[PDB]
From a paper:
Archaeal DNA polymerases from the B-family (polB) have found essential applications in biotechnology. Variants of the archaeal polymerase from [name], TgoT, that can either generate [name] from DNA (TgoT_6G12) or DNA from [name] (TgoT_RT521) have been previously identified. In this study, six X-ray structures of DNA and [name] polymerases are reported: (i) three apo- structures of TgoT, TgoT_6G12, and TgoT_RT521-; (ii) two DNA-bound structures of TgoT_6G12 in binary and ternary complexes; and (iii) one DNA-bound structure of TgoT_6G12, which has incorporated two [name] nucleotides. Consistent with all other DNAPs from B-family, TgoT and its variants fold into five distinct structural subdomains.
In a second experiment, crystals including an incoming nucleotide trapped inside the polymerase active site were generated. The crystals of the ternary complex of TgoT_6G12 diffracted to 3.2 Å, with two molecules per asymmetric unit. However, the thumb region in the ternary complex is mainly ordered. Indeed, only one internal region from amino acid 666 to 690 as well as the C-terminal part from amino acid 763 to the end are poorly defined. Contrary to the structure of TgoT_6G12 in the apo or binary complex, the finger domain of TgoT_6G12 in the ternary complex shows a closed conformation, indicated by a rotation of 24° of its two α-helices (α14 and α15). In the ternary structure of TgoT_6G12, three metal ions are observed at the active site, in the same position as observed with the structure of KOD in ternary complex (Mg2+ in position A, Mn2+ in position B and C). The presence of the two manganese ions was determined by the anomalous signal. The incoming nucleotide (ddTTP) binding site contains two tyrosines: Y494 and Y409. In addition, Y409 forms the bottom of the binding site. ddTTP packs with its sugar moiety against Y409, as previously observed with the dATP in the structure of KOD polymerase ternary complex. In the X-ray ternary complex obtained in the presence of a DNA-DNA duplex, seven of the mutated residues were well defined, which corresponded to V589A, K659Q, E664Q, Q665P, A681S, L704P, and E730G.
Author numbering:
A (entry chain F): 1 to 762
B (entry chain E): 1 to 663, 693 to 704, 718 to 755
The structure:
Amino acid sequence: MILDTDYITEDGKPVIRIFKKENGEFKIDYDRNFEPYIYALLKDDSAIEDVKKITAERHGTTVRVVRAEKVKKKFLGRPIEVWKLYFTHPQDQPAIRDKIKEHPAVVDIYEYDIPFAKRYLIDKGLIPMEGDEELKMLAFAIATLYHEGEEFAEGPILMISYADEEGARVITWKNIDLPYVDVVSTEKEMIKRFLKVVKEKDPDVLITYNGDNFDFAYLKKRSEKLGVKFILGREGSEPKIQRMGDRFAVEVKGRIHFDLYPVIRRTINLPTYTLEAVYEAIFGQPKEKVYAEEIAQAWETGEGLERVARYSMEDAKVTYELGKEFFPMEAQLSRLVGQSLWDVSRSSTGNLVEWFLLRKAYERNELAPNKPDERELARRRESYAGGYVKEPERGLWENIVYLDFRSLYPSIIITHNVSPDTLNREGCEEYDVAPQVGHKFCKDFPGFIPSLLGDLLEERQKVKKKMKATIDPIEKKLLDYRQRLIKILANSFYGYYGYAKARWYCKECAESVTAWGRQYIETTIREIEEKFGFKVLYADTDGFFATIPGADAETVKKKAKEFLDYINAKLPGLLELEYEGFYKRGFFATKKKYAVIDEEDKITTRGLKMVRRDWSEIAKETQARVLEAILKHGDVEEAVRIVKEVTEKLSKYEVPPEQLVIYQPITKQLHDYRARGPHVSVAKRLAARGIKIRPGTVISYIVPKGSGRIGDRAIPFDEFDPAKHKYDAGYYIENQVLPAVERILRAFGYRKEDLRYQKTRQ
Amino acid sequence: MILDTDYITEDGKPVIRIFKKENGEFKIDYDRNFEPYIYALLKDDSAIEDVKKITAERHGTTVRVVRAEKVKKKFLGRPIEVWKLYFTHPQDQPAIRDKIKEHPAVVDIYEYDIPFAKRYLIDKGLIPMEGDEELKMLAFAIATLYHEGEEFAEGPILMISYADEEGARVITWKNIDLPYVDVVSTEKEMIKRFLKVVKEKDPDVLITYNGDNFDFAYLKKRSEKLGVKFILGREGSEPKIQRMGDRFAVEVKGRIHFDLYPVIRRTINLPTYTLEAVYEAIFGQPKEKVYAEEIAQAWETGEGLERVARYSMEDAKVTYELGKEFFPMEAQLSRLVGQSLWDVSRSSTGNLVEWFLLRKAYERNELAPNKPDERELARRRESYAGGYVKEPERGLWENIVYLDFRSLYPSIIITHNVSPDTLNREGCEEYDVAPQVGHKFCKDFPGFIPSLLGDLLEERQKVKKKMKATIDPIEKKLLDYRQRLIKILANSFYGYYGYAKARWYCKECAESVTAWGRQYIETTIREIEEKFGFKVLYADTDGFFATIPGADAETVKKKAKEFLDYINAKLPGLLELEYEGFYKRGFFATKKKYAVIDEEDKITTRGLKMVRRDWSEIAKETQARVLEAILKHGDVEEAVRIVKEVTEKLSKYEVPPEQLVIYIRPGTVISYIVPDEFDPAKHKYDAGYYIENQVLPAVERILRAFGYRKEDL
DNA sequence: AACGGCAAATGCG
DNA sequence: AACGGCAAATGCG
DNA sequence: CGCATT
DNA sequence: CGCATT
Ligand SMILES: Cc1cn([C@H]2C[C@H](O)[C@@H](COP(=O)(O)OP(=O)(O)OP(=O)(O)O)O2)c(=O)[nH]c1=O
Ligand SMILES: Cc1cn([C@H]2C[C@H](O)[C@@H](COP(=O)(O)OP(=O)(O)OP(=O)(O)O)O2)c(=O)[nH]c1=O
Ligand SMILES: [Mg+2]
Ligand SMILES: [Mg+2]
Ligand SMILES: [Mn+2]
Ligand SMILES: [Mn+2]
Ligand SMILES: [Mn+2]
Ligand SMILES: [Mn+2]
């Protein structure tokens, strides 16, 4: 299989290098004949004589057009003849493309900003990560000596740990007596030993957790200080640190540096992305965190260094385990997009779609449209109508089914041939007209993007069938992320039509997809209510919750399956409504906010959690009891007795002050805050008192009754005393308990006045 | 008359500038001898040799202590000897004060954060705005070209309008044919013409409405783009834009930039503070609003520019008229506090109290306590018991008198000598002990704050006497705001004791004032009920509504006057209960919520009416009829027949849809109906909405007191 | 700009 | 590195 | 405006 | 809390 491609320059000419692993052997193949080029559309063919003579400069070197070739291509399916302008070196292109575009005889230029190594993979039809080749993997982590107020990598690396299928080891330059610890004389010998381990093991994949921004840069500064050639690359090169957006990315030539951080960050939704939080979220097992301040104290005092070495060993061990689980998903994405694993694992969804389209356009002899200029970008900022969100039905409902369209927007694109090359194309025998917006789409030939979505949907469904049939819950969770990645990718082709920077931008296509979606959902709602006696409780874009008011579970399931057979027979092409779930009870508060309970007693809440906001244990506990009373017990009157009980106890000062602690994290330096909330106000006072506040510190505070605003009175819970200080009962009622439970009890007709304590007169 | 003070630096030394207007002539007086200083309390006098040698740095400049002087002062009435540490420049103080405080021989430092120019006004005994000097005033406004999604001042100023006693004019760079419009060639010539107008007129006061945050900053960016020296200051300086908390404030040196916005914002309570809303609230006359989008379209198309010029002219005209009315109040406040009009018009009530106390402390050789640090601020957030609020007696009551104490909390402070310097002071022959909280206050000598409140109460009563005898309702309304500002100022000395940032903070003093107030009101209630046979219906802090159940108007008034004579003879010092009003009928719903009607048929409602944007005429009209039936007719059964009549008519679609109207640009009123050009022959209004969300919520809050719930209505 | 986010508690919704 | 932005709208708070 | 739900 | 009444 092909792992990656790049290019080097030999005598001013580029040489493509293809990094491969074939039959367990690493190989580098060289192509010295592939030439860079761009296209030019001219107003007249005779002007090519003047265009061939255009020159530019590139550090003393005169840049010239090597040769030209008139080629017949297509632009949005319409034939167009352009001139393929060849160059000696890819860096000639940025130096001369503006001068060629500015020539009076040149109407426009195309495919001028495609990186040379990626252009090679596309033009040669090569796809990375193909085949039954087994890759050797090795994860690594570093433990460093940190002291606040110091420059980056000023302190030494204390330990370098690594892990693979054979186990995990730690290299350190202090005498720690553990079986997996290798003790060396100095930091220099430790780095040299790690470099030796990677050369001996010769891994195809180097796994890190944030190695793109921390591990490699730290190793680089330490190697520069110690005079060590950190030759990790298979061709003797050192790691190549490049700028990627607002951060950095690191390559190790001949190997795949798989940094798990960007992959995990876009795959799983978590409040924190520490290696410990990621490991527990995936494997359901805890990982102990040993902080930087503890590592430094253990090193300087010599005490408890076994705990630091164990923490370091487990960093490498869990990074290897996480790498094993997430690599198959990324390797499949590399095959789909047709680009290296290093690229697809770090690139945005917009870039994945664009790289996939550039390849398919090449296969189909289609000229790629250019990225918009500043003027065109300003023209593409207008929005369009999206999905339909029904206002939910107030009240408690029983025996509810959730029906949802399978891959709605991609199925609409395939069925109705929604593409920029089919939009208002004259001369066709057949058209599909988008409702409301009226855009017409030619149906005589498959459109560019519609013809490509089918295979993605087929691939996703194969993964879903594998998933539902998986015994292992970890493997099933990873297959769930895999099918969801393809689901998000397929939907991003729709989004891409309305994305201002898209090459194949088509706002008409985007608003037609949403218009057809709005038509299908509203028609389906009308159909289930009028033909089958269902009541649609709530709907959002392509799915809805419905029930037959006076019917048992067996009847509602039976009639939902009858409706699905009926509606699926009426729906055209790839459009299909699926049975997604059954819920015993369910309440629908507002749009995007509701809670449902399945037959196994599992509650699913959407828009109700709101965990980023500041919540007290009393508000969390009250909302938990309210939802338990409504969904589990089916008793709305009990839920309102709980809220009235809590507000009465808060007013009477009967609630233990332990339930009033608000915990919220400090996420940056205290000086870097724009707005000062209660948690920041407490933290600034604690910092002034000598307490070390750092990003990650949780502030546990309580609001007392007093003079100033919330943050002014707010104090740490370690300073509160119920025998001296009276808590702010009104705050816990009006700002914590009531806002959280009112949004739920709105559905049953209860307002804030009904939830508050009686205040009876004597 | 002193308008303002500031300082400049000449050869590293400060020079105070006093901006004056004497006999119609503007003058600048200079003081080159006033020195900055702070105080240090040392553990031993010999350590002054080490303290004198402390140095700091200030951009390459070595900061040193110029000289020291041992001075005898008082800290909370107790003699304390401190060292007055003098410096060359006021900016030396922030650079070296922490190093002096951190010295092991220094116990504490004082008066280290007083701005130099304000320190000068205090130490010299100078008070701004004194005398019968007449000030020349000029208001101004600007009309700009706005386009959404652009940076601040990216578009030009289209018109600059100004107004004074001689009239209002508009300078613009487009040919508009109006008598008051002066047409110039460019935006540059318009700004230069405006600068010329202000230099020629030479006004003492420049009036704006939000000029601190919009007008001056817009002019600044446009002048920087056009290369114009905007020398508005009398010394040739440009407007000085400074940060004041979360907003900005602008000075024009030698003149008083009077921005009406902060003054109006704290004086009048309104849902919106647009210039149009403020003008109608004060003068009772409407002002048309021409929006930014209309101004831009008029300018780009050339159509209807007369309407824009008229709007611009009226902005300057009404800002001048409002400025004339609000300047006397602010000029008097400047004399009371002893600080410039620019400062007193923009500072909070707590800063006015503090600047007044800093001046009085200087006069009395009293060291000012320091403001608290973050740790001390956190220690002062504990609350204390406030006023007493009696649960009201439900039902409709007749022939009710309202008796209320005159300046309660300030009178308690004066009578019982409630002050931080008299609190638990040992050695006195006489004390007053606060009830419940038990704090003792020495009575042998007048306390600092108690000795200052008497003159404020005297001043307020002089304004009240003038007010009640004023024929003009506008002048009477302005005097009402003036006496109320002194009433709130006097009550803020009490609040100041319990204010965490206060220098003269004393929570014991604050809770003793409230404790004495709770004792006087509950004692008075017990006294009127047990001795005079009255029934106290409702009470809040220092006043109560009472009646003699089976008595006519003449009897209740007569017996209330007899009780006042009796109770006033028992009350000590400055404590006095006043006859504040008589009401034919009154209904008391909950605490802070009730409605009373006087003999002239005027209804006063507290806590009942709301400033909500959703006012349907049917809900307002129904609530008006309900209150009229309860207070005028004394018939609860009629009020409930009215609500049942309205809900029945709404259900039957008999109410005209004009009574159901509820009423993006800031200030735009939306007039809508729940189902603008509604048609009863096609559309049916939401009867249930007008019953359950408009009529019932408004009238139920009132009919609750008589036992009626939403189901009965 | 140096001093300015802050006068207090009680109570309803 | 030469490419690289971070696929879309609806809706609550 | 950010984040959550599609 | 937010705003109104003291
Ligand atoms: C989740 C999601 C939805 N949408 C749009 C397109 C989807 O077709 C539509 C409905 O959302 P979904 O029901 O979440 O997605 P889906 O129909 O594509 O997939 P599935 O078979 O699992 O139901 O909302 C996006 O544009 N982007 C997204 O990431
Ligand atoms: C109005 C008001 C009252 N209070 C306190 C102190 C007052 O003395 C007490 C009673 O309020 P008021 O009766 O409104 O005020 P007053 O007694 O000072 O003045 P008047 O002679 O007009 O009756 O409530 C404040 O602390 N701040 C205020 O702004
Ligand atoms: Mg869905
Ligand atoms: Mg009163
Ligand atoms: Mn689905
Ligand atoms: Mn779907
Ligand atoms: Mn009074
Ligand atoms: Mn009073």
